[PDB]
Design brief:
The structure is cut from a larger assembly and holds 3 copies of chain A, 3 copies of chain B, 3 copies of chain C, 2 copies of chain D and 2 copies of chain E. By secondary structure, chain A is mainly β. Chain A has one domain. In chain A, 6% of the residues lie in helices and 26% in strands. Chain A has 3 helices and 10 strands, in the order αββαβββββαβββ. By secondary structure, chain B is mainly beta. Chain B has a two-stranded antiparallel ribbon with strand order 1-2. Chain B is elongated and about 60 Å long. Chain C is mainly β. Chain C has one domain. Helices cover 9% and strands 30% of the residues of chain C. In chain C, the strands form 3 sheets. In chain C, strands 4, 5, 8, 11 and 14 form a 5-stranded antiparallel sheet that branches. Classes of the chains: A mainly beta, B mainly beta, C mainly beta, D mainly beta, E mainly beta. At the B-K interface, β2 of B face loops of K.
Chain lengths: 267, 57, 237, 105, 255, 267, 125, 267, 60, 57, 57, 60, 105
């Protein structure tokens, strides 16, 4: 619940609450009553929806890839990383370090690709989403032994069912995911520099269990990340310039702020 | 073993939560945590600066 | 998992069910309520409030303020009928657009009494006596004052007090009457007659008007909500 | 809804024949009133609060409503010759009722 | 002895006296009061004149002809240019105030008629052309009658407000208006009508220039009728007194 | 429960309950026994279905829009407002101010549009309903970054499932939704005048997640609003004339009431 | 407050209201009551409708011209043909009933006149 | 539980249990032991399935109507009445008065009508069942404003889901539904005579929310009524002759009973 | 959510099952019951009552 | 708030019922009502007729 | 943490409600609120007017 | 089995719902948390901190 | 959104006619501002912060914006002859409003 205002009458004293010294770095804790007369108003407003958990708990798509059931791209391979998208990435960046559990949800959508094969009566499609942990064997063809599933966590979802949702516990060798890393993987300081060097969360593979039918069908899989049980440390200024790459913080110089007419203009 | 907590209602009610999965990483989001402390970022000075008193004596 | 079987009626949508549903925006801090003068908790409280009844809904007069006024005048006779309308608060046009009647058109079953309040808006010197009379269902509407004299009636006399209320009793075989027309549940007939004559002194008008109000007593009930037949729509606005 | 739906009215030639189609409406009935008369084909129609001759050659200007939405839809056919079954179909969206009258002479 | 008819209301420095009057209607049952702190939202110290603004203002009289359809006054707009209530309204941003409406119309025993003195909250009105809304000075009137017109207003490319009396300009039955606090002026018994209106708005305070919370409508249900020889010019004069004025947000004057 | 009648015998006294003064504005509280003889009848009837909550709790469609999966209108954009419909709008107007929670339910229906493309074997359709809060970014094409979903509340519903139902808490800056507003947004009193100026509840966007198949399919989405936890203030007379517009109360002058034959007629 | 003029009489299912009225005259000081058993002479069980018959009947109005000498109504004969009071009178042999006469004649302040409303027992003419 | 028999030995007394007088109208309460010798048998049989509730609680179709998705009959309009069917009607008639709650269940079935339109790939059908209370507005076209649903109770059921089932509370102005009414609606005694005059339970409307596809589809809706919480008064003899009409008890004279060979025949 | 599996027999309609189902019209104030002479609670009570037997069901 | 009642079993067991809907017209059928009184229809005579005693004395 | 309340039945029964969602804006409709006060709109006069006593003295 | 009916809104996905979901990897031993200077629990604490305002946002 | 959407502006030939299309934007409106003027067909267009003559022969170089995204889109047509209904359609993704002006002389 937010703090309320306290009444004040006219004042005339040596003490000055307004005049301060911003050089110290202490933001003045001045309430409205300090520089005027105010009534006693009980503010029942609550800072409930501004909580870090409520701020970042919304499901937000990070990456969508499309795999056909017949042709060159039989299966889809995406390295896990929240940097691919923009809205969720920017939300997370606000904090230099962050420690959150994940609740991945997959929205899979099929589409009969235009073709000329007749008597297209396809049976219900079945899909498999496999999470390869880093250092694990990775599939090369749609039907390799890796797809059989030995110990990796995979979910089998027939089309038309409620979208699959598997929760992921915090997965980081360190004590918190580092949103920003001012360091190189190599002690020599030569090589990749940035968040990509320390963040590896495995790879995600999506394939058609059954070909489905005579005609080609293209399956779009959308991956949604919702941070839960989030704890954030060291708040940082929000990214002002548009993102240009996923593996680095490189940016294009942009105006501090959208301009207005004059210094006295009100638009 | 059900945990009963107050629902988020307006100003001026209970709901029952039972943890099904034993993993404990599957628990619902802990939204009801209204705790704050601006001292870490706001007012980070080593020596207290009373607002009424002059800042730089 | 807990073994369950889905009973018939699952995965359907009902326009009249109360259940729970996850909030799209969690932990929204609603704006705290204040005190606004005149909170309403029941529709029947509004029905109890008075509402002018367009008794003279004749011809073009529904397009003027003349719809509400009921005309009375000093005529050389007695027993002449002043007005008359059926007791159908829902279907009868006389009552249909009144506050009680229009709220009733949002329901199907009604029961209770009615406070027809007649306000004499004539001159201060005019003295007129009137036989407000309600005939219970069963026979034809009374054609003469003597015929109406039998049924429930109040001999309203005009004095310092202007308005007189005719509290229509709830006489009916069924616990509830249909808001729409039906031969089975005919409400009855309400009529007014001249007990004497509205005599006035010279230099004063002999053509007075009377207004009529409608209200529901503290024993009025409604049930079976339905959409009203008065509103209409072709395409979204 | 219509009173006495099956009827056999026999009347001598030369006088008006009164064909009743009195109907009572249920509370459930809240629809436009369409009254149509048929002979064995459409003699008269009542839609949108208006009466239609329907250009029937055998009975033009000899057929009219005796009374209306009040509940009466009777017809007084004048100057008979006409022998057949006269069907009166009052119409409401929940239920539409029809009455058949056999006319003799 | 005692008598119900007589009544005397004193406010500020101006009081009114009615020999024949019907019981006062106290709004929705809530006598107007200052903004309690349980529901305040403006942190500024409110100014409360409490005498300068809470006084009986007498507006302009209007004639009750036998052909007069009705009249409507937007209460905040009506007092916008009268005295400190007007000055303080022009200066301050937010404004909360209860009302004490009082309409006087006296006629001899031989006159006849009947008014409906009813104050309507949120009297949103409709323009003659359906697509556009009415302009200010057509919808609003400063100490002006803003009379209703019995004939339906011709609908063209204009912003004339519908003055249709049988609809009250809100497309609702005029008879059903009774739901709002209302007092009748039946000439035969009572020559005066008083309604005490509480502050009825969804927000704790609102700018009075930005929005008019309540509008006093006088609609003669029974037309005035008199035999030749009686006074032919019987006026209707309205005395509206504000109550518990409370103003915040002092700024430069204007709007 | 409704109040009951009390017995009464013949009476003859100075006190008069019937004769009153309607000028005062007090509706006479006269029971049936006052003007006649009545028996003691215990009325067990209850004013339960006339409650404000029961009066306005029925789900009622407010607006239906149709978006195709291929062509000009790929997605549907409707500003949230209960004024578009007639029955629910009229129900709500009865009260000058109203404070209710919402339970939006979406009834989506697809339709194979007539065409000439052969081998039309479309896969199950998937739809997305996104609520853009006012001031939020709004989609321009069916595949813009806005559709990915950053923080806005959106529901993904595959066709053939139970219709989606998300509850909405009270959403108003004021202390109650104002059904009628006799005011202008501009202090100058020049500009839009009416309910539209103060009521903005955001915008609703509906799109096809997957194209679905070779042939064009048109998807009709119907939006249902059911007020719950309703509190209403200041009852007002019901709208007598037919509505002509959604943003204003403008009306066409209509007869106070349907006419009858004569002042003594009983029809 | 209180006022002597106003009065409301309710009987059966029909009541009357008089704004200006003079105090009711209660006969010879004896309010009508049912036949006590101390003085009964008919052994049959009497029927007492008590609502069907005890109600306000309004007879036919008569004009008060400046030349009108007077009027007389035989109360039993007057109601012989009105409602159940008339029907039950036609059927039953013996009949005992009290009366509540009420005569209305309203005129403006500028009219003048005076009536004698008197009920005469045994008006043998 | 049923009553049991009591033992009896040989008897010789003035008292006669068998000889009685059926003129009185008292059915003799004679147990088997009265006219013979019987042993003490404990009858554990229970009259549980003969209860009025168990007798009439079975779901039983009352009326099936068929509405096409394209053509003249776009929507189906049936007045609510249990008299349309035979088995349930006869079951209810056994009691002159009856007071029961209802549990309507709708079994909807679609059918691809024979046509010549090619590429018929129809999407899943969606249906709407609306109950118009008596005196309520009734739809004239499949797309009138009435279908939007203001306050009437309507159920939206997509095809392939479990059949819709909405319970109905007792709906009668009187204190019990009258199975038989020996009366006219008109005091004059001229007009309709019978059960139809007093029983109006509203009208039921069924329509296709979406056209469904290019080809015409005909939807058969079957309405099932199951009385519950039933209380019955005044038992009456069962209807011997076959029903001929729904609005009246009119019948065709039929033999009291199927004949046999002779008065001593055993077939 | 509570993890459940639907047993066989789900999503079916049985003419002889007693279960619960949401009321189409909530909070309907039913008309209070009265006393009607001759309430029947069991069919067998009617069977006990006498009934004439057409023993001579011969021919016409 | 669960109501526990005996199941209908053979001759010579409990089940739990919880009312979900608050309307009370949605409750399951009340089948377990085994109450009967043949006196209303059978033996409706005003004066008792003992079967053993002669009917018409 | 289940709340047990009476079902709406006829004149002349319990149901159990458990709040699942913690938001509290997802709770079922509060239909069972039969409270009324006609004084605010009916009889709004400042000074009480006894019906039996004359209105305008 | 327990007889249930699925209310409207079942089998749908909502971007703003908090519920439970089986963990893909069970019994994962998370790395124990440490103390990092400056934990943030509410966005408004960051809003309270000072921020320079580009008042002269004119032209270039 | 647009003020006074139905308007009838009559002006004599020879002087500039001021055609107002002042509009107010809702909070829900966050879209590219497309202002298009039509006559009875496209006189002027405003997309991507630029003004388009649109090569209209009847009104080329006589039509210009009097003011812009601030809320004004009025046009001062100069040297009238032009009689017709001028439609101004300010465009936003949640709602697009149009104003029709009848011009005389």
């Amino acid at each position: 619940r937010v703090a309320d205002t306290v009444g004040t009458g006219p004042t005339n004293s040596e003490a000055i609450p307004a005049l301060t010294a911003a050089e110290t770095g202490h933001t003045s804790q001045v309430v409205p009553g300090d520089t005027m007369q105010t009534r006693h108003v009980k503010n029942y407003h609550s800072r409930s929806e501004s909580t870090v958990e409520n701020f970042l708990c919304r499901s937000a798509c990070v990456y969508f890839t499309e795999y056909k059931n017949s042709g060159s791209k039989r299966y889809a391979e995406w390295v896990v990383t929240t940097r691919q998208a923009a809205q969720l990435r920017r939300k997370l960046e606000f904090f230099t370090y962050i420690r959150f559990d994940l609740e991945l949800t997959f929205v899979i959508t099929s589409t009969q690709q235009p073709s000329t094969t007749q008597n297209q009566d396809a049976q219900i499609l079945t899909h498999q989403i496999m999470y390869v942990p880093p250092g694990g064997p990775v599939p090369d063809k749609v039907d390799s032994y890796v797809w059989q599933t030995s110990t990796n966590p995979s979910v089998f979802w027939t089309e038309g069912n409620a979208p699959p949702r598997m929760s992921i516990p915090f997965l980081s060798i360190g004590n918190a995911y580092s949103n920003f890393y001012d360091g190189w993987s190599d002690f020599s300081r030569d090589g990749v520099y940035g968040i990509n060097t320390l963040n590896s969360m495995g790879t995600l593979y999506a394939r058609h269990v059954n070909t489905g039918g005579t005609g080609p069908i293209k399956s779009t899989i959308r991956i949604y990340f919702k941070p839960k049980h989030v704890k954030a440390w060291i708040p940082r200024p929000p990214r002002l310039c548009q993102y240009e790459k996923a593996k680095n913080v490189n940016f294009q110089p942009s105006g501090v702020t959208t301009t207005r007419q004059s210094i006295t203009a009100m638009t | 073993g059900a945990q009963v907590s107050t629902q988020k209602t307006g100003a001026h009610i209970h709901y029952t939560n039972i943890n099904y999965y034993k993993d404990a990483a599957s628990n619902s989001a802990t939204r009801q945590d209204f705790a704050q402390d601006p001292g870490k970022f706001t007012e980070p000075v080593k020596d207290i600066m009373i607002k009424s008193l002059p800042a730089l004596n | 998992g807990l073994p369950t079987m889905n009973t018939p009626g699952s995965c359907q949508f009902l326009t009249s069910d109360d259940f729970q549903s996850p909030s799209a925006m969690p932990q929204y801090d609603v704006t705290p309520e204040m005190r606004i003068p005149g909170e309403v908790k029941n529709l029947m409280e509004i029905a109890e409030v008075d509402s002018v009844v367009p008794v003279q809904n004749v011809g073009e007069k529904v397009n003027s303020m003349e719809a509400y006024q009921i005309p009375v005048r000093s005529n050389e006779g007695s027993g002449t009928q002043v007005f008359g309308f059926p007791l159908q608060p829902g279907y009868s046009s006389v009552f249909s657009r009144t506050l009680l009647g229009e709220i009733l058109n949002y329901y199907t079953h009604w029961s209770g009494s009615i406070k027809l309040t007649f306000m004499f808006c004539g001159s201060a010197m005019a003295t007129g006596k009137f036989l407000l009379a309600y005939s219970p269902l069963g026979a034809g509407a009374p054609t003469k004052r003597v015929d109406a004299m039998l049924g429930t009636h109040v001999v309203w006399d005009v004095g310092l007090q202007s308005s007189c209320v005719l509290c229509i009793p709830w006489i009916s075989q069924t616990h509830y009457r249909y808001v729409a027309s039906d031969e089975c549940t005919a409400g009855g007939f309400i009529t007014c007659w001249y007990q004497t004559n509205i005599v006035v002194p010279a230099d004063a008008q002999s053509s007075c008007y009377i207004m009529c109000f409608v209200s529901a007593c503290n024993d009025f009930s409604v049930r079976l909500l339905k959409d009203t037949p008065f509103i209409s729509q072709e395409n979204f606005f | 809804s219509i009173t006495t739906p099956e009827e056999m009215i026999e009347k001598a030639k030369g006088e008006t024949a009164y064909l009743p189609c009195k109907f009572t409406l249920s509370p459930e009935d809240q629809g436009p009133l369409d009254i149509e008369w048929l002979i064995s084909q459409v003699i008269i129609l009542y839609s949108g609060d208006k009466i239609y001759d329907d250009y029937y050659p055998d009975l033009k200007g000899r057929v009219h409503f005796t009374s209306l939405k009040s509940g009466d839809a009777s017809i007084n056919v004048t100057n008979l010759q006409d022998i057949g079954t006269y069907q009166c179909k009052v119409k409401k969206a929940p239920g539409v009722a029809n009455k058949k009258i056999h006319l003799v002479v | 002895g005692y008598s119900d008819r007589v009544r005397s209301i004193t406010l500020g420095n101006s009081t009114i006296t009615t020999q024949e009057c019907a019981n006062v209607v106290v709004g929705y049952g809530v006598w107007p009061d200052y903004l309690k702190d349980n529901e305040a939202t403006a942190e500024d110290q409110p100014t409360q004149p409490d005498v300068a603004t809470c006084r009986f203002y007498t507006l302009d009289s209007v004639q009750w002809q036998k052909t007069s359809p009705g009249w409507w006054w937007k209460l905040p707009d009506a007092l916008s240019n009268l005295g400190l209530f007007g000055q303080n309204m022009q200066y301050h941003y937010l404004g909360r105030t209860g009302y004490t409406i009082h309409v006087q119309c006296n006629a001899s025993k031989f006159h006849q008629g009947c008014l409906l003195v009813v104050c309507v909250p949120e009297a949103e009105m409709g323009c003659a052309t359906l697509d556009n809304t009415p302009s200010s000075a057509e919808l609003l009137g400063g100490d002006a009658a803003k009379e209703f017109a019995g004939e339906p207003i011709a609908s063209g490319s204009n912003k004339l407000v519908q003055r249709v009396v049988y609809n009250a300009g809100m497309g609702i039955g005029v008879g059903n208006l009774t739901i709002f606090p209302h007092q009748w002026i039946n000439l035969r018994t009572n020559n005066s009508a008083t309604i005490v209106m509480p502050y009825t708005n969804s927000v704790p305070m609102d700018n009075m220039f930005r929005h008019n919370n309540v509008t006093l409508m006088v609609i003669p249900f029974v037309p005035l009728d008199y035999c030749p020889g009686s006074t032919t010019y019987v006026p209707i004069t309205v005395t509206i007194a504000p109550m518990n004025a409370e103003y915040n947000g002092l700024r430069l004057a204007g709007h």
